Amino acid sequence: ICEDDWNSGERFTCTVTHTDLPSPLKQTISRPKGVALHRPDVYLLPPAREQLNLR
Amino acid sequence: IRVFAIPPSFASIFLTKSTKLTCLVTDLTTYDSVTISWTRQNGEAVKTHTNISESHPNATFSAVGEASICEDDWNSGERFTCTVTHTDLPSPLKQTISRPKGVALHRPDVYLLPPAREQLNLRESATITCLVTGFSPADVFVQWMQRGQPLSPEKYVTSAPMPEPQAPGRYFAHSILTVSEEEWNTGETYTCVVAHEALPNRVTERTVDKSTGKPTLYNVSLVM
Amino acid sequence: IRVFAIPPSFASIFLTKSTKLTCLVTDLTTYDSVTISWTRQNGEAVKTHTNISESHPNATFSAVGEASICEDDWNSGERFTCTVTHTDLPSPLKQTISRPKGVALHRPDVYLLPPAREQLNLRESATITCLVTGFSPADVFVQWMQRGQPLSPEKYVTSAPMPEPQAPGRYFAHSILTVSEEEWNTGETYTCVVAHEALPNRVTERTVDKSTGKPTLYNVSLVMSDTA
Amino acid sequence: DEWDCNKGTNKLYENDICLPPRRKHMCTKQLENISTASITTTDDLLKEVLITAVNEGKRLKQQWEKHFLCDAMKYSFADLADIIRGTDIWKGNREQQKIQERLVKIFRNIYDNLEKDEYEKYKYGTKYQNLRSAWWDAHRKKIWNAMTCSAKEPPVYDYVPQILRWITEWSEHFCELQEKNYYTCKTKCEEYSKFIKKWNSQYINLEKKFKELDENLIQFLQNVKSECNEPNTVDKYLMYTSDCRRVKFSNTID
Numbered sequence: 001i002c003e004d005d006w007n008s009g010e011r012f013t014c015t016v017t018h019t020d021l022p023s024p025l026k027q028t029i030s031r032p033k034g035v036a037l038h039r040p041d042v043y044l045l046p047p048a049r050e051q052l053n054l055r
Numbered sequence: 056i057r058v059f060a061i062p063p064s065f066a067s068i069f070l071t072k073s074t075k076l077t078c079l080v081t082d083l084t085t086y087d088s089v090t091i092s093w094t095r096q097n098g099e100a101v102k103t104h105t106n107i108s109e110s111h112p113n114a115t116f117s118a119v120g121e122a123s124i125c126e127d128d129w130n131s132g133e134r135f136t137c138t139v140t141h142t143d144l145p146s147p148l149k150q151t152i153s154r155p156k157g158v159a160l161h162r163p164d165v166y167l168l169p170p171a172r173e174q175l176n177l178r179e180s181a182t183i184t185c186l187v188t189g190f191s192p193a194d195v196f197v198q199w200m201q202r203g204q205p206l207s208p209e210k211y212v213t214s215a216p217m218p219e220p221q222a223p224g225r226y227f228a229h230s231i232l233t234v235s236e237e238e239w240n241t242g243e244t245y246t247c248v249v250a251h252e253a254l255p256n257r258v259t260e261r262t263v264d265k266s267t268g269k270p271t272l273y274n275v276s277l278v279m
Numbered sequence: 280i281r282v283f284a285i286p287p288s289f290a291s292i293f294l295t296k297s298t299k300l301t302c303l304v305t306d307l308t309t310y311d312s313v314t315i316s317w318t319r320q321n322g323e324a325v326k327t328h329t330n331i332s333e334s335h336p337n338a339t340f341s342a343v344g345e346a347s348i349c350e351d352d353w354n355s356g357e358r359f360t361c362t363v364t365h366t367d368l369p370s371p372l373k374q375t376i377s378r379p380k381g382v383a384l385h386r387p388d389v390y391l392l393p394p395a396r397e398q399l400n401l402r403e404s405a406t407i408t409c410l411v412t413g414f415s416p417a418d419v420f421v422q423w424m425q426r427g428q429p430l431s432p433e434k435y436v437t438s439a440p441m442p443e444p445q446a447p448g449r450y451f452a453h454s455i456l457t458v459s460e461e462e463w464n465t466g467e468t469y470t471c472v473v474a475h476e477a478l479p480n481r482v483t484e485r486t487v488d489k490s491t492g493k494p495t496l497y498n499v500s501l502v503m504s505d506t507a
Numbered sequence: 508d509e510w511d512c513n514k515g516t517n518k519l520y521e522n523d524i525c526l527p528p529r530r531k532h533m534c535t536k537q538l539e540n541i542s543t544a545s546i547t548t549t550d551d552l553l554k555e556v557l558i559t560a561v562n563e564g565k566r567l568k569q570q571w572e573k574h575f576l577c578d579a580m581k582y583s584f585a586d587l588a589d590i591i592r593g594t595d596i597w598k599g600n601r602e603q604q605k606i607q608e609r610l611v612k613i614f615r616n617i618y619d620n621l622e623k624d625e626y627e628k629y630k631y632g633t634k635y636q637n638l639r640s641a642w643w644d645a646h647r648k649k650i651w652n653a654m655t656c657s658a659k660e661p662p663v664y665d666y667v668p669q670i671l672r673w674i675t676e677w678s679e680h681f682c683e684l685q686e687k688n689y690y691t692c693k694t695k696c697e698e699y700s701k702f703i704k705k706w707n708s709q710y711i712n713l714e715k716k717f718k719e720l721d722e723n724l725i726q727f728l729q730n731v732k733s734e735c736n737e738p739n740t741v742d743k744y745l746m747y748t749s750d751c752r753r754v755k756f757s758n759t760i761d
């Protein structure tokens with residue numbers, strides 16, 4: 001599916017039928033809501049001095 | 056029926072210096088006539104087991120045992136068997152546990168990285184990494200020492216050992232110590248201690264402060 | 280009478296975060312029973328012209344439609360149909376747009392340049408230039424960010440892609456921004472985000488600072504003496 | 508009661524302005540010692556600003572008891588407004604750099620946790636000061652109410668640019684202290700000679716930068732030129748309550 005459908009939070013349902021199952025088993029899923037947002041702060045670090053001495 | 060025995064590791068035998076054992080049986084009857092005891096390979100009975108946990112309200116069973124053992128006796132290879140017997144299941148169960156043998160041996164190489172300039176520029180906190188690497192037995196205990204007194208466990212975390220990308224048998228780990236930026240500016244030494252068997256001694260120690268890492272700048276030369 | 284349809288470019292998609300289509304009619308004043316619709320090549324009506332634009336008084340009809348759901352289908356290059364039908368015209372007029380194919384996708388190579396010392400000495404204003412170059416398709420959107428926020432489009436100016444003489448398929452561009460001397464002596468960071476088709480991540484950032492250009496050695500040999 | 512008008516670290520930019528003493532020694536420790544980890548919402552940020560306003564109010568109340576209190580408190584509210592809005596001048600202070608370095612975290616989190624009908628309006632800017640000013644103007648009424656607990660209407664000097672307000676504290680302070688100065692004469696005479704020379708060049712240095720009548724500074728100057736019938740005057744005629752333009756300022760002793 002397109003990302004616009006998924007990120008909008010449109011609820012989707014899964015339908016599965018089988019001979020073993022007397023009734024179809026249905027599962028639903030949607031994008032979780034109520035979460036908070038924060039941005040990562042990358043700090044790329046350089047190698048230690050001692051390790052380069054071993055070469 | 057499920058009977059689980061957890062062998063001791065460096066965390067248990069080194070943090071408290073007591074090679075405690077445990078008999079953790081789960082997913083059985085909550086209330087039943089339960090037998091909990093450890094038995095050596097030779098057959099002598101172990102000492103008492105106290106403070107067995109109450110039945111877990113989710114219909115799963117819980118049990119707690121402790122068996123103090125000689126430190127090198129566990130290293131000696133004596134197989135230990137936890138005894139579990141119930142009236143619900145008449146068949147007794149004995150499970151043997153022993154330490155792995157034949158694994159390779161390799162020395163950790165502790166490197167400690169000072170915080171980056173940008174992180175100090177944010178003026179909130181500095182995170183100091185401790186890059187334990189190159190140790191094979193895949194177990195380690197990392198603790199942080201400030202000025203020679205123990206540091207609070209809430210101020211650091213530790214990853215589990217993961218395989219080295221370019222080494223088939225070795226492992227590495229991580230640990231960040233969130234030190235306040237003000238406390239870092241007024242020079243206070245922080246140091247790592249690594250607990251690992253393959254070291255010539257038990258532990259190895261490394262430390263870095265602002266004095267470390269500053270190179271020579273002023274080649275003032277006077278010529279006659 | 281004439282109808283012009285233009286497809287969106289990478290800049291519009293990146294800035295608007297959606298795909299917008301135009302099926303615009305020229306030299307046609309306001310009449311009744313004007314039908315515009317964008318339909319799938321397969322035949323189904325993927326989207327209708329909800330909230331139709333009001334007719335311009337000078338014989339111009341906008342009639343824009345949004346294919347927002349099918350972001351990837353436009354990139355796939357599938358052909359779109361616009362249905363223009365009026366009472367006077369017997370045969371309905373059709374407009375067809377699609378993504379072109381066959382063009383090369385050489386990657387950009389941005390090089391951000393610090394201001395000159397002569398400009399800094401006059402202490403008036405520094406101008407940081409962002410020499411985007413090398414891209415094969417002629418579509419680039421450049422923004423400037425300071426401490427994780429896009430700067431206003433008034434402060435920077437982007438030049439149109441100019442052909443590069445050394446290689447036929449490649450192009451180049453540039454942009455400038457007028458930083459104050461105080462805010463650059465303070466030593467802040469400025470970033471030049473480039474958006475292009477050929478980039479695998481479709482975005483690239485670069486950073487400049489007061490510390491970007493400094494000399495390393497200062498070997499001085501003071502040879503004071505008294506006798507010549 | 509010294510203004511410390513020498514460059515030093517009082518103001519980074521090369522133009523000379525004399526910092527008022529009310530800016531120095533403020534109880535800004537509440538915002539100074541903030542924890543950006545524990546705070547990520549607008550409601551928690553308002554409470555600490557209200558606390559800081561209360562601390563400033565009681566600090567001024569204690570300082571005065573060592574209308575004039577109302578004026579000083581008014582300009583202190585304007586100063587705190589400028590601190591929160593992020594357009595302050597005192598960048599040279601090492602303490603005040605950290606505050607403007609850790610309010611960026613709070614307002615970046617706020618801008619991250621916003622909704623679409625405001626995200627597109629506040630998307631473009633610089634150092635998040637547009638929505639910073641929007642947040643201040645949204646919560647400006649409550650802050651002064653918490654401040655005025657010690658010892659109505661919202662103040663208006665907070666929109667005034669800081670340099671002209673600093674001129675206003677200078678005028679009030681100098682008229683107050685010259686009233687304090689006077690109310691045999693050989694004993695008193697020599698101090699007045701030192702009283703003039705300690706602030707003799709204090710008037711002349713700022714007058715050289717009153718020309719060219721910041722981005723937002725010029726628009727306010729142009730608008731006030733259209734009104735008040737005095738476009739170009741070295742004296743503002745706002746709350747001077749005394750004679751101005753060198754009439755009794757210099758060499759009045761003889």
Ligand SMILES: *[C@@H]1O[C@H](CO)[C@@H](O)[C@H](O)[C@H]1NC(C)=O
Pocket residue numbers: 271274276
């Ligand atoms: C410092 O000066 C000495 C003087 O002989 C020289 O030998 C050495 O290479 C210099 N080192 C650096 C890092 O410049």
Ligand SMILES: *[C@@H]1O[C@H](CO)[C@@H](O)[C@H](O)[C@H]1NC(C)=O
Pocket residue numbers: 496498499500
């Ligand atoms: C710097 O100057 C010294 C003499 O003052 C000279 O010997 C040295 O070679 C110079 N450095 C380099 C990199 O050439």
